Amino acid sequence: IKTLHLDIRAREAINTSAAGIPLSVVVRIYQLKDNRSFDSADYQALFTGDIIAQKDVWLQPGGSVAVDMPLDDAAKFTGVAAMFLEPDQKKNTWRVVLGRDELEPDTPRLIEVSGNTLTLLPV
Amino acid sequence: RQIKTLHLDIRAREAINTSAAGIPLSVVVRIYQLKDNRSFDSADYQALFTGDNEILAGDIIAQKDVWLQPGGSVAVDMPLDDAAKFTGVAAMFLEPDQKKNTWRVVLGRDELEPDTPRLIEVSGNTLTLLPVKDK
Amino acid sequence: YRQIKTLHLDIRAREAINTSAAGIPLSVVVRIYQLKDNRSFDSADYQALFTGDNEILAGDIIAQKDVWLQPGGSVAVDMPLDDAAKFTGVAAMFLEPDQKKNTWRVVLGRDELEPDTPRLIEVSGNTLTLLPV
Amino acid sequence: YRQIKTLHLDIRAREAINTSAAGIPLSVVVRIYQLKDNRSFDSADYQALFTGDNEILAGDIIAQKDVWLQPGGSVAVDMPLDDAAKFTGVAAMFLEPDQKKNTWRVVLGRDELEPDTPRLIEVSGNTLTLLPV
Amino acid sequence: QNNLSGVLHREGSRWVPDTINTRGLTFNPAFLKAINTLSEIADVAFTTGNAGLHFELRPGTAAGVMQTTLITDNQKLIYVNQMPVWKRFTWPADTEAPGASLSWVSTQAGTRQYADLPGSWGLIRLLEMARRKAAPGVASGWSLSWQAQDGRMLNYTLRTEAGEGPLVLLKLRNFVLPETVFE
Amino acid sequence: QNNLSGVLHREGSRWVPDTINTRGLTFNPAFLKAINTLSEIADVAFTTGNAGLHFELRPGTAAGVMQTTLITDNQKLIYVNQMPVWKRFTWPADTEAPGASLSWVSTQAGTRQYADLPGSWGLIRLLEMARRKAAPGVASGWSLSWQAQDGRMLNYTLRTEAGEGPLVLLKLRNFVLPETVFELS
Amino acid sequence: QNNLSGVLHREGSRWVPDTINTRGLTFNPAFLKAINTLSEIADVAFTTGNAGLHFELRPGTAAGVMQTTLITDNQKLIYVNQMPVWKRFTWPADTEAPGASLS
């Protein structure tokens, strides 16, 4: 609630092209007061008012990262979107929305990313 | 009251990173957030080209990669993580001077003034940390 | 509680402001405005404020001051705030200003002015950052 | 302590001021300025202050007085110092002024004015010497 | 067109000699090859009348590259392996710092500049060091892969509007005007 | 058009030798270089029948110069490092004191003026003391750069409208009409 | 009027081929299209002997625009949705900074 605790477990083969070579991913974390704008925006124009905070983490391929950031009390939701080579906008698997009640704060949440798919792991 | 956010800025002189013909080409500096300054001070100039993400294994928290065009300047305000106890600034010239070891600075966390940043004047192929003076 | 009367403004300039293509810092000009209304000064572009003139924006500007921010140096601004004036404005004349996000001016209201401690205004490249107290 | 209000200035002129090529003394003009700032008045050249005009230096000049220093004679200047005025300037219009060392004008501040005894200002050729009390 | 207007015609875009009205006059065969090259540059790089052209650029990826940045004449291109978009370029650009610069971030390494080439001729010096071939996907597309240090191949896909685009100015590498036109 | 009506043609802008009726009658090859130069300046500066042309300056930036002031013929250009524009000049304007002057405000010292050249030919004296080169970035441009004192540069970017603009009057520098039309040997 | 004095007439505003004295002498039919265009611009813009013409703009309305400013050569047209009028422009005026801008 007070400070964020996330962990992003990037796989060994992420963002692969048709050749299938692992490529790094930059991700973009957003704090959300209302999910009428973040969840109604496409992949293109989102990377070019409601946007509160913006954190950017490179996903070193094969490795992972532990993400702690200071939260806001107006951040009703947390939307975390990545930049894939094949944006599956028809499945919208390139972003996840975590509500503020979905935070179990003292143990960092895990989100495993495989290829071009972000997957929120079950708590 | 606290160091919380890093304020730092670099002013190059007009003759930096000079090649064999005397031509000042632009140089790249890199910024580190470190915990213990032993691994960076003891490692050499060559291995920080490719092993810079690896020879500081776990020592790096936040990394900034800032250009520097010759005669120009740049200011960087990156948020400082509270666990980081050292800040590594590594310039990567075309030719170093490893003997005097003047191509790097290690700024201690207590040295950072909260509002007034610290200049890092670059002259020739050397880095230098200037004294602190304000109102 | 009346004595907001004297305006104190200390503007610090960083070691890289208003950089050209070759990254060299250039001494920008900061134009200090005093208004009667904030809506017109919000609704002007960068061209129609410095280049040329106006009449209704010019009808709202009452006081006006021009300082030179030497790069790395600073300036101390002390000017008497007019009684009919109810708004302060600060704009820079940047080389490559950001017109989409409007980060080249700030609107310091009258009730946000400290009576004795001057407000710090910091510039970094092409932004007019209003520093929080 | 408020009564600085009346300005008293006695300017003595020596027996050789503003000499031409043949050394003949010529009666110079001394232009007396009263300002709101000193930084613009130090940043003007000899050309852009007498020849032509300005707008921001002219925006700072509030009072202005012109005396004729007959060579060897003198003049007595009594003028009311304005309340919003905070600086006094005195400049000469020399025939061959020294622009590198800037010895053709002086910046008498407001707090350095004596209330009753006028300050002596002496000229010798092409220098405006502010004589010490 | 003021001295050989009778024996030498500009048909289309080449300078053909005339079979009739030639005695024999034996042209220098390099000289018919020299100005056939200069009249080919002028229809692609110098088309307006002054030095100027417009190409596009789409970034490509490789094994072990996180960020590859390309600056030419204060036109910035930054790729962190997102969705590839063409960016319309312009050479030369009206600036006070004309030149190019290319930096890559490996997964192993950080930022290493490949080169920073100053001067108005900068982007040609950058386009000299890259191995080229016809990119078969898009026409007219050329593959551009700068082999850097640390073995990585910074990939780029270049599309021009007419002809080879900015690649043609490397035809002048050890160009020589013939001292003699006739023999 | 009164004396060489047969042997000299006014083709385009230049004068050419007429190829017919040129048996044994040779021109001095400096004389054709002369009045093809005095008929180029005629087509750049003196087009309307009298001296007048319009050239555009865009100011430039330099390391550590706060304000450059170029005044020609009571037309100002005060540049204090804002977003640069084009000021369309006019030479020679019919004003009260035609001249040319250049004053620069450093970071260190006050405003030392670079030169103050009065008269109607002030502006040609200023472009003569430049260090000009051709401009690749803009066409048809010419990036002037006067070197002031104290090692400071003052950069400007001249764009003409036709030909060479007021740079074409620097073909007149040490120009001499040839004493001999026809060469005899 | 010096070289084609027989075969080309200045009829009206256009140039036409003269029907007499054109036995076997044909014009390039782009060349007649060329200088019947360069003598049609000559009768609109360059009438008086130099560049000058007068056109009139009337502003229009649009959905959700509060004010449009057209400036040409230091001649303004500020339209804030009042009763529309006609502002008689001219081009090119001999002012100090000729240009065009739309905000």
Tab-separated table of N, CA and C in Angstrom, chain D residues 51-126:
chain	number	residue	atom	x	y	z
D	51	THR	N	24.771	58.435	-28.126
D	51	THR	CA	24.280	58.354	-29.493
D	51	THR	C	23.124	57.374	-29.562
D	52	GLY	N	22.020	57.819	-30.112
D	52	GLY	CA	20.853	56.989	-30.128
D	52	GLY	C	20.227	56.933	-28.752
D	53	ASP	N	19.624	55.787	-28.471
D	53	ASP	CA	18.826	55.607	-27.277
D	53	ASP	C	18.742	54.127	-26.951
D	54	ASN	N	17.927	53.804	-25.955
D	54	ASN	CA	17.608	52.426	-25.639
D	54	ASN	C	16.147	52.360	-25.221
D	55	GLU	N	15.758	51.218	-24.679
D	55	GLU	CA	14.428	51.036	-24.118
D	55	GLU	C	14.449	50.482	-22.706
D	56	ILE	N	15.402	49.611	-22.386
D	56	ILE	CA	15.478	49.060	-21.044
D	56	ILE	C	16.442	49.871	-20.184
D	57	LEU	N	17.547	50.342	-20.759
D	57	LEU	CA	18.326	51.364	-20.081
D	57	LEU	C	17.518	52.645	-19.968
D	58	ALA	N	16.781	52.988	-21.021
D	58	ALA	CA	15.855	54.106	-20.937
D	58	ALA	C	14.679	53.812	-20.023
D	59	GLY	N	14.343	52.539	-19.822
D	59	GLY	CA	13.348	52.193	-18.827
D	59	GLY	C	13.843	52.330	-17.405
D	60	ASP	N	15.160	52.372	-17.210
D	60	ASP	CA	15.736	52.527	-15.886
D	60	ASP	C	16.099	53.963	-15.556
D	61	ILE	N	16.356	54.790	-16.560
D	61	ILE	CA	16.639	56.193	-16.305
D	61	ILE	C	15.339	56.881	-15.922
D	62	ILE	N	15.319	57.490	-14.746
D	62	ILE	CA	14.160	58.208	-14.245
D	62	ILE	C	14.403	59.712	-14.238
D	63	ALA	N	15.530	60.144	-13.688
D	63	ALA	CA	15.918	61.543	-13.738
D	63	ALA	C	17.185	61.691	-14.564
D	64	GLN	N	17.359	62.876	-15.139
D	64	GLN	CA	18.449	63.111	-16.073
D	64	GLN	C	18.720	64.604	-16.140
D	65	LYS	N	19.987	64.982	-16.068
D	65	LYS	CA	20.369	66.381	-15.966
D	65	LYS	C	21.656	66.604	-16.743
D	66	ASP	N	21.776	67.764	-17.380
D	66	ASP	CA	22.897	68.040	-18.267
D	66	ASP	C	23.536	69.365	-17.896
D	67	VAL	N	24.808	69.323	-17.529
D	67	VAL	CA	25.556	70.506	-17.138
D	67	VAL	C	26.710	70.707	-18.107
D	68	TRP	N	27.219	71.931	-18.160
D	68	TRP	CA	28.332	72.279	-19.030
D	68	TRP	C	29.524	72.673	-18.182
D	69	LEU	N	30.552	71.848	-18.203
D	69	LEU	CA	31.757	72.082	-17.422
D	69	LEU	C	32.677	72.955	-18.257
D	70	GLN	N	32.582	74.256	-18.041
D	70	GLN	CA	33.561	75.189	-18.564
D	70	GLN	C	34.946	74.822	-18.033
D	71	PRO	N	35.993	74.855	-18.863
D	71	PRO	CA	37.310	74.360	-18.428
D	71	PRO	C	37.915	75.267	-17.372
D	72	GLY	N	38.153	74.709	-16.192
D	72	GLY	CA	38.591	75.480	-15.061
D	72	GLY	C	37.480	75.939	-14.150
D	73	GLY	N	36.269	76.083	-14.664
D	73	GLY	CA	35.137	76.458	-13.849
D	73	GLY	C	34.554	75.263	-13.130
D	74	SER	N	33.323	75.432	-12.669
D	74	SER	CA	32.661	74.392	-11.901
D	74	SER	C	31.162	74.522	-12.092
D	75	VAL	N	30.430	73.659	-11.401
D	75	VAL	CA	28.977	73.669	-11.455
D	75	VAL	C	28.463	73.090	-10.146
D	76	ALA	N	27.251	73.477	-9.768
D	76	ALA	CA	26.611	73.003	-8.553
D	76	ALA	C	25.291	72.348	-8.915
D	77	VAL	N	25.142	71.083	-8.553
D	77	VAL	CA	23.970	70.305	-8.915
D	77	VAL	C	23.150	70.052	-7.664
D	78	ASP	N	21.917	70.549	-7.662
D	78	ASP	CA	20.945	70.264	-6.613
D	78	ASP	C	19.662	69.810	-7.280
D	79	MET	N	19.317	68.543	-7.097
D	79	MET	CA	18.109	67.996	-7.679
D	79	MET	C	17.488	67.020	-6.694
D	80	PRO	N	16.158	66.913	-6.673
D	80	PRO	CA	15.505	66.022	-5.705
D	80	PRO	C	15.625	64.568	-6.132
D	81	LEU	N	16.268	63.762	-5.290
D	81	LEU	CA	16.389	62.331	-5.538
D	81	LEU	C	15.035	61.659	-5.380
D	82	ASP	N	14.609	60.948	-6.420
D	82	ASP	CA	13.326	60.265	-6.396
D	82	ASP	C	13.357	59.093	-5.422
D	83	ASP	N	12.188	58.792	-4.854
D	83	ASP	CA	12.102	57.756	-3.830
D	83	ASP	C	12.286	56.367	-4.418
D	84	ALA	N	11.681	56.101	-5.578
D	84	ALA	CA	11.870	54.816	-6.237
D	84	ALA	C	13.257	54.686	-6.847
D	85	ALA	N	13.966	55.798	-7.028
D	85	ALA	CA	15.337	55.768	-7.510
D	85	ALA	C	16.240	55.225	-6.415
D	86	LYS	N	17.154	54.341	-6.785
D	86	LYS	CA	18.079	53.768	-5.829
D	86	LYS	C	19.527	53.857	-6.277
D	87	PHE	N	19.813	54.530	-7.390
D	87	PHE	CA	21.181	54.638	-7.873
D	87	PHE	C	21.377	55.948	-8.611
D	88	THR	N	22.577	56.500	-8.481
D	88	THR	CA	22.964	57.719	-9.170
D	88	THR	C	24.108	57.397	-10.114
D	89	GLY	N	23.995	57.848	-11.355
D	89	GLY	CA	25.061	57.708	-12.322
D	89	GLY	C	25.479	59.067	-12.841
D	90	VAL	N	26.764	59.194	-13.140
D	90	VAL	CA	27.323	60.392	-13.742
D	90	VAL	C	28.196	59.934	-14.894
D	91	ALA	N	27.935	60.451	-16.086
D	91	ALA	CA	28.750	60.131	-17.243
D	91	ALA	C	29.128	61.409	-17.967
D	92	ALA	N	30.299	61.390	-18.585
D	92	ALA	CA	30.768	62.490	-19.402
D	92	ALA	C	30.637	62.117	-20.863
D	93	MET	N	30.631	63.125	-21.723
D	93	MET	CA	30.653	62.898	-23.158
D	93	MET	C	32.016	63.354	-23.650
D	94	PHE	N	32.999	62.478	-23.523
D	94	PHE	CA	34.359	62.891	-23.799
D	94	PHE	C	34.628	62.884	-25.291
D	95	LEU	N	35.647	63.637	-25.692
D	95	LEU	CA	36.020	63.642	-27.099
D	95	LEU	C	36.719	62.352	-27.475
D	96	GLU	N	37.716	61.950	-26.692
D	96	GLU	CA	38.418	60.683	-26.877
D	96	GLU	C	38.343	59.915	-25.568
D	97	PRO	N	37.237	59.232	-25.319
D	97	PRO	CA	37.070	58.535	-24.048
D	97	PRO	C	37.833	57.227	-24.035
D	98	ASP	N	38.094	56.749	-22.828
D	98	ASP	CA	38.817	55.500	-22.619
D	98	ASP	C	37.797	54.396	-22.408
D	99	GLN	N	37.539	53.621	-23.451
D	99	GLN	CA	36.521	52.592	-23.353
D	99	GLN	C	37.043	51.284	-22.790
D	100	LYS	N	38.354	51.081	-22.749
D	100	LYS	CA	38.829	49.795	-22.262
D	100	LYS	C	38.798	49.725	-20.744
D	101	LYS	N	39.196	50.797	-20.064
D	101	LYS	CA	39.243	50.802	-18.610
D	101	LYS	C	38.011	51.422	-17.969
D	102	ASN	N	37.115	52.003	-18.775
D	102	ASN	CA	35.817	52.529	-18.342
D	102	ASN	C	35.964	53.602	-17.266
D	103	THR	N	36.799	54.594	-17.547
D	103	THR	CA	37.036	55.679	-16.611
D	103	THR	C	36.255	56.927	-16.970
D	104	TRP	N	35.169	56.781	-17.719
D	104	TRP	CA	34.364	57.911	-18.144
D	104	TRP	C	32.997	57.922	-17.487
D	105	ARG	N	32.766	57.065	-16.498
D	105	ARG	CA	31.539	57.128	-15.722
D	105	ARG	C	31.788	56.557	-14.338
D	106	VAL	N	30.917	56.932	-13.403
D	106	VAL	CA	30.995	56.495	-12.017
D	106	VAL	C	29.599	56.128	-11.538
D	107	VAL	N	29.536	55.187	-10.604
D	107	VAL	CA	28.273	54.671	-10.087
D	107	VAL	C	28.207	55.031	-8.610
D	108	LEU	N	27.616	56.179	-8.296
D	108	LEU	CA	27.433	56.605	-6.913
D	108	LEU	C	26.156	55.968	-6.385
D	109	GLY	N	26.299	55.051	-5.442
D	109	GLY	CA	25.145	54.393	-4.869
D	109	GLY	C	24.363	55.308	-3.948
D	110	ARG	N	23.167	54.846	-3.577
D	110	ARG	CA	22.276	55.690	-2.793
D	110	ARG	C	22.755	55.810	-1.355
D	111	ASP	N	23.266	54.726	-0.788
D	111	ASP	CA	23.720	54.753	0.593
D	111	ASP	C	25.051	55.468	0.775
D	112	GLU	N	25.702	55.880	-0.304
D	112	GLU	CA	26.962	56.599	-0.215
D	112	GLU	C	26.794	58.099	-0.374
D	113	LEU	N	25.567	58.597	-0.364
D	113	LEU	CA	25.322	60.016	-0.544
D	113	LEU	C	25.305	60.732	0.799
D	114	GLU	N	26.073	61.809	0.893
D	114	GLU	CA	26.079	62.642	2.086
D	114	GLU	C	24.847	63.545	2.094
D	115	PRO	N	24.251	63.792	3.263
D	115	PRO	CA	22.949	64.476	3.269
D	115	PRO	C	23.049	65.967	3.036
D	116	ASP	N	24.139	66.596	3.463
D	116	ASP	CA	24.278	68.039	3.338
D	116	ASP	C	25.508	68.485	2.565
D	117	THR	N	26.664	67.865	2.793
D	117	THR	CA	27.874	68.241	2.080
D	117	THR	C	27.870	67.602	0.697
D	118	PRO	N	28.017	68.373	-0.374
D	118	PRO	CA	28.026	67.771	-1.706
D	118	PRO	C	29.319	67.014	-1.951
D	119	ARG	N	29.225	65.977	-2.776
D	119	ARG	CA	30.389	65.190	-3.148
D	119	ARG	C	31.146	65.857	-4.287
D	120	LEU	N	32.458	65.959	-4.130
D	120	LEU	CA	33.307	66.540	-5.155
D	120	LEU	C	33.593	65.491	-6.214
D	121	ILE	N	33.387	65.859	-7.474
D	121	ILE	CA	33.742	65.026	-8.615
D	121	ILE	C	34.664	65.841	-9.503
D	122	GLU	N	35.869	65.343	-9.719
D	122	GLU	CA	36.884	66.095	-10.428
D	122	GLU	C	37.206	65.390	-11.732
D	123	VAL	N	37.418	66.174	-12.783
D	123	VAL	CA	37.758	65.660	-14.100
D	123	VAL	C	39.112	66.210	-14.495
D	124	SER	N	39.933	65.366	-15.102
D	124	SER	CA	41.283	65.743	-15.506
D	124	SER	C	41.528	65.150	-16.883
D	125	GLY	N	41.187	65.888	-17.926
D	125	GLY	CA	41.379	65.332	-19.243
D	125	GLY	C	40.216	64.453	-19.632
D	126	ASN	N	40.382	63.147	-19.476
D	126	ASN	CA	39.361	62.193	-19.875
D	126	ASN	C	39.109	61.160	-18.789
